[PDB]
């Protein structure tokens with residue numbers, strides 16, 4: 468069973484195996500007075516591992532590297548951050564010092580900089596325009612357009628039919644918007660439509676926070692975002 472927020476002490480990291488060579492990592496962090504869960508992804512890349520997003524903070528991310536060594540043993544060699552917030556780049560300095568090459572789009576790195584957040588080392592090219600995709604080892608990276616943030620990326624594992632939507636996708640139980648201070652509410656439904664046109668056979672959809680499900684997370688997220696708009 469997928470771990471939930473009350474089951475994970477802040478500072479601990481769970482791994483959840485989704486398919487052969489695909490796991491999610493789950494951690495918790497206090498933010499604005501409450502403790503939230505947060506998801507990232509781990510994708511096997513032959514004798515290496517590709518990491519998607521930190522575990523939200525230097526300490527959680529150190530524990531993430533430890534859990535990966537304990538439970539998988541393959542080396543993390545590259546990391547991608549899917550947007551510029553703490554829950555995606557917080558812990559990038561730990562990844563870098565540990566020898567992980569850290570990547571993000573130029574927009575993400577620039578917004579992280581403006582924000583005073585840790586900054587992935589390398590820019591990802593080819594993701595500047597809505598609908599752009601690029602191959603990155605065992606995954607495709609997709610910029611669906613502005614949504615949760617103007618820079619947010621989604622990650623697809625074609626061999627596993629795993630779509631990692633990051634914080635642009637909500638879990639099914641979520642009935643209100645959440646942190647939208649950096650969102651583009653008007654653009655967000657359109658960006659989700661691009662995701663749906665691109666990955667309609669996704670069998671496992673992972674939100675930035677909370678429980679994975681099926682393709683219905685997409686439409687559901689559109690509904691919640693619009694409802695937040697209309698009031």
Ligand SMILES: Nc1cccc(-c2cn(-c3cccc(C(=O)O)c3C(=O)O)nn2)c1
Nearest residue numbers: 498503552553554582584634645646675676
């Ligand atoms: N340094 C900085 C600046 C602004 C925002 C953040 C941040 C906000 N985070 C969130 C906390 C709880 C929930 C969510 C969500 O996706 O709904 C987020 C988020 O990613 O915005 N995570 N990092 C950090």
Ligand SMILES: [Zn+2]
Nearest residue numbers: 550552615634
């Ligand atoms: Zn965010």
Ligand SMILES: [Zn+2]
Nearest residue numbers: 554634675676
């Ligand atoms: Zn988030």
